Design a protein around this ligand. Sequence first.
Ligand code: RUB
Lengths: 220, 220
Amino acid sequence: HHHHHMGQLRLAVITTAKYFIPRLIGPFCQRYPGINVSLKVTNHEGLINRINDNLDDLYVLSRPPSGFDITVQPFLDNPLVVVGPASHPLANQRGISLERLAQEPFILRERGSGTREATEQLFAAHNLNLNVKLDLGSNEAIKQAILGGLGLAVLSYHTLTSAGATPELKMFEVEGFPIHRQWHAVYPAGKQLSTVAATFLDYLLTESQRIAADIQIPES
Amino acid sequence: HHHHHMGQLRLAVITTAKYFIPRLIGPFCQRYPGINVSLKVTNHEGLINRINDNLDDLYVLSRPPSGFDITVQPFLDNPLVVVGPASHPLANQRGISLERLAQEPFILRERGSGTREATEQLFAAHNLNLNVKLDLGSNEAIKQAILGGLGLAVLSYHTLTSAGATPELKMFEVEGFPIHRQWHAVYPAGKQLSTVAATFLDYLLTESQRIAADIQIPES
Ligand SMILES: O=C(COP(=O)(O)O)[C@H](O)[C@H](O)COP(=O)(O)O
Protein backbone atom coordinates (compact mmCIF):
# COMPACT_ATOMS: atom_id res chain seq x y z
CA HIS A 1 0.00 0.00 0.00
CA HIS A 2 1.07 3.53 -0.87
CA HIS A 3 0.23 6.70 0.98
CA HIS A 4 -0.04 9.15 -1.89
CA HIS A 5 -2.75 8.72 -4.51
CA MET A 6 -2.09 9.90 -8.06
CA GLY A 7 -5.84 10.39 -8.64
CA GLN A 8 -9.03 11.39 -6.83
CA LEU A 9 -12.76 10.72 -7.34
CA ARG A 10 -15.27 13.06 -5.66
CA LEU A 11 -18.87 11.76 -5.55
CA ALA A 12 -21.96 13.17 -3.85
CA VAL A 13 -25.10 11.05 -3.74
CA ILE A 14 -28.65 11.26 -2.46
CA THR A 15 -29.05 9.50 0.91
CA THR A 16 -30.79 6.38 -0.39
CA ALA A 17 -28.05 5.87 -3.01
CA LYS A 18 -25.63 5.06 -0.17
CA TYR A 19 -26.85 1.46 -0.40
CA PHE A 20 -25.92 1.20 -4.08
CA ILE A 21 -22.94 3.45 -4.92
CA PRO A 22 -20.36 1.40 -2.86
CA ARG A 23 -21.11 -1.64 -5.02
CA LEU A 24 -19.53 0.38 -7.80
CA ILE A 25 -16.77 2.02 -5.75
CA GLY A 26 -15.51 -1.33 -4.48
CA PRO A 27 -14.68 -3.04 -7.77
CA PHE A 28 -13.62 0.33 -9.27
CA CYS A 29 -11.02 0.85 -6.56
CA GLN A 30 -9.81 -2.74 -6.96
CA ARG A 31 -9.25 -2.03 -10.68
CA TYR A 32 -7.59 1.36 -9.98
CA PRO A 33 -5.84 1.06 -6.59
CA GLY A 34 -4.09 4.43 -7.00
CA ILE A 35 -7.36 6.37 -6.60
CA ASN A 36 -8.63 7.81 -3.35
CA VAL A 37 -12.40 8.28 -3.21
CA SER A 38 -14.42 10.90 -1.40
CA LEU A 39 -18.16 10.27 -1.06
CA LYS A 40 -20.66 12.74 0.34
CA VAL A 41 -24.14 11.49 1.25
CA THR A 42 -26.87 14.11 1.75
CA ASN A 43 -30.42 15.15 0.80
CA HIS A 44 -31.59 17.05 -2.28
CA GLU A 45 -30.98 20.49 -0.78
CA GLY A 46 -27.46 19.54 0.27
CA LEU A 47 -26.64 18.21 -3.19
CA ILE A 48 -27.90 21.39 -4.95
CA ASN A 49 -25.65 23.49 -2.72
CA ARG A 50 -22.68 21.29 -3.60
CA ILE A 51 -23.48 21.58 -7.32
CA ASN A 52 -23.87 25.34 -6.88
CA ASP A 53 -20.38 25.48 -5.31
CA ASN A 54 -18.96 22.97 -7.85
CA LEU A 55 -17.52 20.72 -5.15
CA ASP A 56 -17.62 17.23 -6.70
CA ASP A 57 -17.00 15.37 -9.96
CA LEU A 58 -20.31 13.47 -10.13
CA TYR A 59 -23.70 13.64 -8.42
CA VAL A 60 -26.43 11.01 -8.00
CA LEU A 61 -29.94 12.46 -7.66
CA SER A 62 -33.57 11.44 -8.07
CA ARG A 63 -34.95 14.49 -9.85
CA PRO A 64 -32.69 16.60 -12.11
CA PRO A 65 -32.31 20.08 -10.60
CA SER A 66 -33.34 23.38 -12.19
CA GLY A 67 -31.14 26.43 -12.67
CA PHE A 68 -27.81 24.71 -13.42
CA ASP A 69 -25.73 23.98 -16.52
CA ILE A 70 -25.73 20.17 -16.15
CA THR A 71 -25.73 16.94 -18.09
CA VAL A 72 -28.16 14.33 -16.72
CA GLN A 73 -28.01 10.57 -17.36
CA PRO A 74 -30.52 8.08 -15.92
CA PHE A 75 -28.91 4.84 -14.87
CA LEU A 76 -30.96 2.94 -12.31
CA ASP A 77 -34.48 2.23 -11.10
CA ASN A 78 -35.34 3.26 -7.55
CA PRO A 79 -38.69 1.61 -6.77
CA LEU A 80 -40.57 2.59 -3.62
CA VAL A 81 -42.05 -0.40 -1.79
CA VAL A 82 -43.91 -1.34 1.37
CA VAL A 83 -41.59 -2.67 4.09
CA GLY A 84 -42.47 -4.48 7.27
CA PRO A 85 -41.21 -7.14 9.65
CA ALA A 86 -41.23 -10.76 8.53
CA SER A 87 -43.31 -11.62 11.62
CA HIS A 88 -46.15 -9.29 10.58
CA PRO A 89 -49.38 -11.11 9.67
CA LEU A 90 -49.45 -9.49 6.22
CA ALA A 91 -45.79 -10.41 5.62
CA ASN A 92 -46.53 -13.49 3.48
CA GLN A 93 -49.92 -12.45 2.07
CA ARG A 94 -50.12 -12.08 -1.71
CA GLY A 95 -51.79 -9.13 -3.40
CA ILE A 96 -52.54 -7.08 -0.29
CA SER A 97 -55.15 -4.48 -1.11
CA LEU A 98 -54.53 -0.86 -0.38
CA GLU A 99 -57.49 -0.95 1.88
CA ARG A 100 -56.23 -3.72 4.04
CA LEU A 101 -52.92 -1.78 4.17
CA ALA A 102 -54.45 1.62 5.04
CA GLN A 103 -55.79 0.24 8.36
CA GLU A 104 -52.05 -0.44 9.43
CA PRO A 105 -49.89 2.12 11.27
CA PHE A 106 -47.13 3.70 9.21
CA ILE A 107 -43.72 5.21 9.87
CA LEU A 108 -42.84 7.56 7.03
CA ARG A 109 -40.47 10.31 6.01
CA GLU A 110 -41.49 13.89 6.69
CA ARG A 111 -44.24 15.61 4.77
CA GLY A 112 -42.80 17.12 1.62
CA SER A 113 -40.33 14.20 1.24
CA GLY A 114 -40.30 12.24 -2.01
CA THR A 115 -41.33 8.88 -0.57
CA ARG A 116 -43.94 10.42 1.70
CA GLU A 117 -45.69 12.37 -1.06
CA ALA A 118 -45.75 9.29 -3.33
CA THR A 119 -47.66 7.25 -0.75
CA GLU A 120 -49.87 10.22 0.19
CA GLN A 121 -50.60 10.95 -3.49
CA LEU A 122 -51.32 7.27 -4.07
CA PHE A 123 -53.56 7.07 -0.98
CA ALA A 124 -55.45 10.14 -2.25
CA ALA A 125 -56.36 8.48 -5.56
CA HIS A 126 -58.17 5.70 -3.68
CA ASN A 127 -59.72 8.18 -1.22
CA LEU A 128 -58.13 6.45 1.80
CA ASN A 129 -56.62 7.82 5.01
CA LEU A 130 -52.99 7.04 5.81
CA ASN A 131 -52.42 6.26 9.53
CA VAL A 132 -49.10 7.99 10.28
CA LYS A 133 -47.82 6.92 13.69
CA LEU A 134 -44.43 8.60 13.44
CA ASP A 135 -42.48 10.86 11.16
CA LEU A 136 -38.70 10.22 10.90
CA GLY A 137 -36.16 11.94 8.67
CA SER A 138 -33.90 8.92 8.15
CA ASN A 139 -34.07 5.57 6.34
CA GLU A 140 -32.12 3.88 9.15
CA ALA A 141 -34.33 5.37 11.89
CA ILE A 142 -37.46 4.17 10.05
CA LYS A 143 -36.11 0.63 9.68
CA GLN A 144 -35.16 0.60 13.37
CA ALA A 145 -38.69 1.80 14.21
CA ILE A 146 -40.22 -1.03 12.13
CA LEU A 147 -38.22 -3.71 13.97
CA GLY A 148 -39.33 -2.12 17.23
CA GLY A 149 -42.85 -2.96 16.13
CA LEU A 150 -44.25 0.50 15.43
CA GLY A 151 -45.76 -0.51 12.07
CA LEU A 152 -44.96 -0.59 8.34
CA ALA A 153 -43.16 1.87 6.05
CA VAL A 154 -42.79 2.97 2.45
CA LEU A 155 -39.11 3.00 1.54
CA SER A 156 -36.97 2.65 -1.51
CA TYR A 157 -36.21 -0.99 -2.28
CA HIS A 158 -32.52 -0.19 -1.95
CA THR A 159 -32.88 0.22 1.84
CA LEU A 160 -33.41 -3.58 1.92
CA THR A 161 -29.97 -4.28 0.42
CA SER A 162 -27.71 -3.29 3.31
CA ALA A 163 -24.54 -5.35 3.57
CA GLY A 164 -25.46 -8.56 5.37
CA ALA A 165 -29.21 -7.90 5.08
CA THR A 166 -31.28 -10.57 6.82
CA PRO A 167 -34.83 -11.77 6.08
CA GLU A 168 -36.00 -9.83 9.18
CA LEU A 169 -37.29 -6.88 7.13
CA LYS A 170 -39.00 -7.74 3.88
CA MET A 171 -40.77 -6.11 1.00
CA PHE A 172 -44.56 -6.69 1.12
CA GLU A 173 -46.55 -7.62 -1.99
CA VAL A 174 -49.07 -4.76 -2.20
CA GLU A 175 -51.34 -3.37 -4.90
CA GLY A 176 -50.14 -0.07 -6.36
CA PHE A 177 -46.50 -0.84 -5.40
CA PRO A 178 -43.72 -0.61 -6.41
CA ILE A 179 -43.94 3.04 -7.39
CA HIS A 180 -41.29 3.57 -10.06
CA ARG A 181 -38.64 6.28 -9.55
CA GLN A 182 -35.21 6.69 -11.15
CA TRP A 183 -31.70 7.79 -10.20
CA HIS A 184 -29.68 10.06 -12.49
CA ALA A 185 -25.98 10.76 -12.81
CA VAL A 186 -25.45 14.52 -13.00
CA TYR A 187 -22.35 16.60 -13.73
CA PRO A 188 -21.65 20.21 -14.81
CA ALA A 189 -21.84 20.64 -18.56
CA GLY A 190 -19.53 23.66 -18.68
CA LYS A 191 -16.31 21.75 -18.00
CA GLN A 192 -15.02 18.42 -19.23
CA LEU A 193 -15.01 15.51 -16.79
CA SER A 194 -11.65 14.51 -15.38
CA THR A 195 -10.23 11.24 -16.72
CA VAL A 196 -10.94 9.49 -13.42
CA ALA A 197 -14.53 10.75 -13.24
CA ALA A 198 -15.23 10.00 -16.91
CA THR A 199 -13.84 6.49 -16.41
CA PHE A 200 -16.09 6.05 -13.36
CA LEU A 201 -19.15 7.42 -15.16
CA ASP A 202 -18.66 4.87 -17.96
CA TYR A 203 -18.26 2.12 -15.36
CA LEU A 204 -21.41 3.23 -13.53
CA LEU A 205 -23.40 3.16 -16.77
CA THR A 206 -22.10 -0.25 -17.90
CA GLU A 207 -21.91 -2.01 -14.51
CA SER A 208 -25.16 -0.91 -12.81
CA GLN A 209 -27.46 -3.32 -14.67
CA ARG A 210 -25.30 -6.25 -13.57
CA ILE A 211 -25.64 -5.10 -9.97
CA ALA A 212 -29.38 -4.47 -10.40
CA ALA A 213 -29.75 -8.18 -11.23
CA ASP A 214 -27.57 -9.27 -8.29
CA ILE A 215 -29.66 -7.35 -5.72
CA GLN A 216 -32.92 -8.24 -7.58
CA ILE A 217 -34.39 -4.77 -8.02
CA PRO A 218 -38.12 -5.37 -8.67
CA GLU A 219 -39.28 -4.23 -12.06
CA SER A 220 -42.72 -3.48 -10.82
CA HIS B 1 -59.29 0.54 28.27
CA HIS B 2 -57.60 2.04 31.38
CA HIS B 3 -54.49 3.97 30.31
CA HIS B 4 -52.95 5.72 33.28
CA HIS B 5 -50.25 7.40 31.16
CA MET B 6 -51.30 9.95 28.54
CA GLY B 7 -49.15 12.85 27.43
CA GLN B 8 -46.77 14.26 24.82
CA LEU B 9 -43.18 13.09 24.54
CA ARG B 10 -40.78 15.08 22.34
CA LEU B 11 -37.33 13.52 21.84
CA ALA B 12 -34.37 14.86 19.89
CA VAL B 13 -31.22 12.80 19.33
CA ILE B 14 -27.81 13.05 17.62
CA THR B 15 -27.57 11.16 14.30
CA THR B 16 -25.63 8.17 15.70
CA ALA B 17 -28.41 7.55 18.26
CA LYS B 18 -30.67 6.51 15.35
CA TYR B 19 -28.96 3.12 15.79
CA PHE B 20 -30.40 2.52 19.29
CA ILE B 21 -33.14 5.05 20.18
CA PRO B 22 -35.88 4.48 17.55
CA ARG B 23 -35.96 0.72 18.19
CA LEU B 24 -36.75 1.40 21.89
CA ILE B 25 -39.77 3.60 21.08
CA GLY B 26 -41.61 0.53 19.78
CA PRO B 27 -41.90 -1.44 23.03
CA PHE B 28 -42.30 1.81 24.99
CA CYS B 29 -45.36 2.75 22.93
CA GLN B 30 -46.68 -0.81 23.14
CA ARG B 31 -46.54 -0.47 26.93
CA TYR B 32 -47.92 3.12 26.99
CA PRO B 33 -50.19 3.53 23.93
CA GLY B 34 -51.58 6.82 25.30
CA ILE B 35 -48.22 8.62 25.07
CA ASN B 36 -47.73 10.48 21.81
CA VAL B 37 -44.08 10.33 20.80
CA SER B 38 -42.19 12.53 18.36
CA LEU B 39 -38.53 11.88 17.58
CA LYS B 40 -36.22 14.30 15.76
CA VAL B 41 -32.85 13.06 14.44
CA THR B 42 -30.26 15.74 13.70
CA ASN B 43 -26.59 16.71 13.95
CA HIS B 44 -24.82 18.48 16.81
CA GLU B 45 -25.37 22.03 15.56
CA GLY B 46 -29.05 21.29 14.96
CA LEU B 47 -29.40 19.68 18.37
CA ILE B 48 -27.77 22.63 20.13
CA ASN B 49 -30.28 24.96 18.44
CA ARG B 50 -33.21 22.82 19.63
CA ILE B 51 -31.93 22.87 23.22
CA ASN B 52 -31.51 26.66 22.99
CA ASP B 53 -35.13 27.02 21.72
CA ASN B 54 -36.49 24.54 24.30
CA LEU B 55 -38.26 22.44 21.68
CA ASP B 56 -38.06 18.95 23.21
CA ASP B 57 -38.44 17.17 26.54
CA LEU B 58 -35.24 15.08 26.33
CA TYR B 59 -32.08 15.25 24.21
CA VAL B 60 -29.65 12.41 23.46
CA LEU B 61 -26.02 13.34 22.71
CA SER B 62 -22.53 12.02 23.53
CA ARG B 63 -20.59 14.78 25.16
CA PRO B 64 -22.68 17.09 27.37
CA PRO B 65 -22.77 20.57 25.83
CA SER B 66 -21.33 23.69 27.39
CA GLY B 67 -23.28 26.88 28.03
CA PHE B 68 -26.68 25.45 29.07
CA ASP B 69 -28.44 24.86 32.39
CA ILE B 70 -29.02 21.11 32.02
CA THR B 71 -29.30 17.90 33.99
CA VAL B 72 -27.24 15.07 32.50
CA GLN B 73 -27.95 11.35 32.78
CA PRO B 74 -25.42 8.85 31.36
CA PHE B 75 -27.05 5.81 29.90
CA LEU B 76 -24.94 3.90 27.37
CA ASP B 77 -21.35 3.36 26.30
CA ASN B 78 -20.84 3.38 22.53
CA PRO B 79 -17.10 2.65 22.16
CA LEU B 80 -15.09 3.10 18.97
CA VAL B 81 -13.48 -0.08 17.62
CA VAL B 82 -11.31 -1.22 14.72
CA VAL B 83 -13.14 -3.41 12.20
CA GLY B 84 -12.09 -5.37 9.16
CA PRO B 85 -13.24 -8.37 7.15
CA ALA B 86 -12.95 -11.79 8.79
CA SER B 87 -10.59 -12.92 6.01
CA HIS B 88 -8.07 -10.17 6.73
CA PRO B 89 -4.65 -11.47 7.87
CA LEU B 90 -4.89 -9.37 11.07
CA ALA B 91 -8.39 -10.66 11.95
CA ASN B 92 -7.18 -13.18 14.56
CA GLN B 93 -3.91 -11.48 15.54
CA ARG B 94 -3.59 -10.49 19.18
CA GLY B 95 -2.38 -7.10 20.38
CA ILE B 96 -1.96 -5.34 17.04
CA SER B 97 0.15 -2.22 17.50
CA LEU B 98 -0.79 1.15 16.07
CA GLU B 99 2.46 0.99 14.07
CA ARG B 100 1.29 -2.27 12.50
CA LEU B 101 -2.20 -0.87 11.95
CA ALA B 102 -0.80 2.29 10.28
CA GLN B 103 0.40 0.30 7.27
CA GLU B 104 -3.11 -0.51 6.26
CA PRO B 105 -5.49 1.58 4.15
CA PHE B 106 -8.33 3.07 6.15
CA ILE B 107 -11.93 3.85 5.29
CA LEU B 108 -13.25 6.63 7.52
CA ARG B 109 -16.07 9.13 7.91
CA GLU B 110 -15.69 12.78 6.94
CA ARG B 111 -13.72 15.34 8.94
CA GLY B 112 -15.63 16.63 11.94
CA SER B 113 -17.09 13.21 12.63
CA GLY B 114 -16.60 11.70 16.05
CA THR B 115 -15.03 8.51 14.70
CA ARG B 116 -12.71 10.34 12.29
CA GLU B 117 -11.41 12.92 14.78
CA ALA B 118 -10.90 10.33 17.52
CA THR B 119 -8.88 8.24 15.06
CA GLU B 120 -6.85 11.19 13.74
CA GLN B 121 -6.04 12.39 17.27
CA LEU B 122 -4.91 8.95 18.44
CA PHE B 123 -2.65 8.34 15.45
CA ALA B 124 -1.19 11.85 15.76
CA ALA B 125 -0.47 11.18 19.44
CA HIS B 126 1.86 8.37 18.31
CA ASN B 127 3.29 10.46 15.44
CA LEU B 128 1.81 8.11 12.90
CA ASN B 129 0.42 8.98 9.48
CA LEU B 130 -3.05 7.59 8.87
CA ASN B 131 -3.63 6.42 5.28
CA VAL B 132 -7.24 7.46 4.67
CA LYS B 133 -7.77 6.00 1.20
CA LEU B 134 -11.57 6.32 1.20
CA ASP B 135 -13.42 9.09 3.03
CA LEU B 136 -17.05 8.03 2.96
CA GLY B 137 -19.91 9.96 4.51
CA SER B 138 -21.90 6.89 5.53
CA ASN B 139 -21.48 3.91 7.84
CA GLU B 140 -23.37 1.77 5.32
CA ALA B 141 -20.89 2.74 2.60
CA ILE B 142 -17.97 2.10 4.96
CA LYS B 143 -19.22 -1.40 5.78
CA GLN B 144 -19.61 -2.30 2.09
CA ALA B 145 -16.12 -0.94 1.39
CA ILE B 146 -14.70 -3.11 4.18
CA LEU B 147 -16.41 -6.22 2.80
CA GLY B 148 -15.06 -5.36 -0.66
CA GLY B 149 -11.50 -5.66 0.62
CA LEU B 150 -10.55 -1.98 0.51
CA GLY B 151 -9.17 -1.86 4.05
CA LEU B 152 -10.01 -1.22 7.69
CA ALA B 153 -12.32 1.16 9.48
CA VAL B 154 -13.16 2.65 12.86
CA LEU B 155 -16.85 2.48 13.86
CA SER B 156 -18.84 2.77 17.08
CA TYR B 157 -20.01 -0.54 18.52
CA HIS B 158 -23.70 0.06 17.92
CA THR B 159 -23.09 1.03 14.29
CA LEU B 160 -21.49 -2.37 13.52
CA THR B 161 -24.96 -3.78 12.75
CA SER B 162 -28.04 -2.04 11.35
CA ALA B 163 -31.75 -2.69 11.38
CA GLY B 164 -32.14 -6.10 9.76
CA ALA B 165 -28.50 -6.45 8.75
CA THR B 166 -25.48 -8.19 10.29
CA PRO B 167 -22.52 -7.83 7.91
CA GLU B 168 -19.58 -10.20 8.44
CA LEU B 169 -17.23 -7.70 10.02
CA LYS B 170 -14.74 -8.65 12.70
CA MET B 171 -13.51 -6.43 15.52
CA PHE B 172 -9.71 -6.33 15.64
CA GLU B 173 -7.75 -6.48 18.90
CA VAL B 174 -5.75 -3.23 18.70
CA GLU B 175 -3.79 -1.24 21.28
CA GLY B 176 -5.43 2.08 22.12
CA PHE B 177 -8.85 0.55 21.27
CA PRO B 178 -11.68 0.51 22.21
CA ILE B 179 -12.09 4.26 22.66
CA HIS B 180 -14.87 4.69 25.19
CA ARG B 181 -17.59 7.26 24.58
CA GLN B 182 -20.60 7.77 26.79
CA TRP B 183 -24.07 8.71 25.61
CA HIS B 184 -26.24 10.94 27.79
CA ALA B 185 -29.83 12.02 28.05
CA VAL B 186 -29.98 15.73 28.88
CA TYR B 187 -32.88 18.00 29.83
CA PRO B 188 -33.22 21.62 31.05
CA ALA B 189 -32.65 21.77 34.78
CA GLY B 190 -34.90 24.82 35.31
CA LYS B 191 -38.10 22.76 34.85
CA GLN B 192 -39.22 19.46 36.28
CA LEU B 193 -39.50 16.68 33.75
CA SER B 194 -43.06 16.05 32.65
CA THR B 195 -44.60 12.85 33.97
CA VAL B 196 -44.31 11.16 30.55
CA ALA B 197 -40.70 12.31 30.07
CA ALA B 198 -39.70 10.98 33.50
CA THR B 199 -41.43 7.70 32.60
CA PHE B 200 -39.49 7.52 29.31
CA LEU B 201 -36.20 8.40 31.02
CA ASP B 202 -36.69 5.66 33.61
CA TYR B 203 -37.49 3.27 30.74
CA LEU B 204 -34.41 4.36 28.76
CA LEU B 205 -32.16 3.77 31.76
CA THR B 206 -33.63 0.35 32.43
CA GLU B 207 -33.32 -0.87 28.87
CA SER B 208 -29.83 0.51 28.36
CA GLN B 209 -28.41 -1.19 31.44
CA ARG B 210 -30.04 -4.34 30.05
CA ILE B 211 -28.00 -3.86 26.86
CA ALA B 212 -24.91 -3.07 28.95
CA ALA B 213 -25.32 -6.30 30.94
CA ASP B 214 -25.66 -8.30 27.70
CA ILE B 215 -22.22 -7.15 26.44
CA GLN B 216 -20.50 -6.85 29.84
CA ILE B 217 -16.81 -7.88 30.08
CA PRO B 218 -14.28 -7.65 32.92
CA GLU B 219 -12.87 -4.12 33.23
CA SER B 220 -9.90 -2.76 35.16
O1 RUB C 1 -28.04 11.92 5.68
C1 RUB C 1 -28.23 10.89 6.25
C2 RUB C 1 -29.68 10.36 6.35
O2 RUB C 1 -29.78 9.22 7.17
P1 RUB C 1 -30.21 7.73 6.58
O3 RUB C 1 -29.11 7.08 5.81
O4 RUB C 1 -30.53 6.83 7.76
O5 RUB C 1 -31.44 7.84 5.70
C3 RUB C 1 -27.02 10.14 6.83
O6 RUB C 1 -26.13 11.04 7.43
C4 RUB C 1 -26.27 9.42 5.72
O7 RUB C 1 -27.22 8.75 4.93
C5 RUB C 1 -25.30 8.41 6.35
O8 RUB C 1 -26.01 7.57 7.22
P2 RUB C 1 -25.25 6.23 7.82
O9 RUB C 1 -23.91 6.59 8.42
O10 RUB C 1 -26.11 5.64 8.91
O11 RUB C 1 -25.05 5.22 6.70
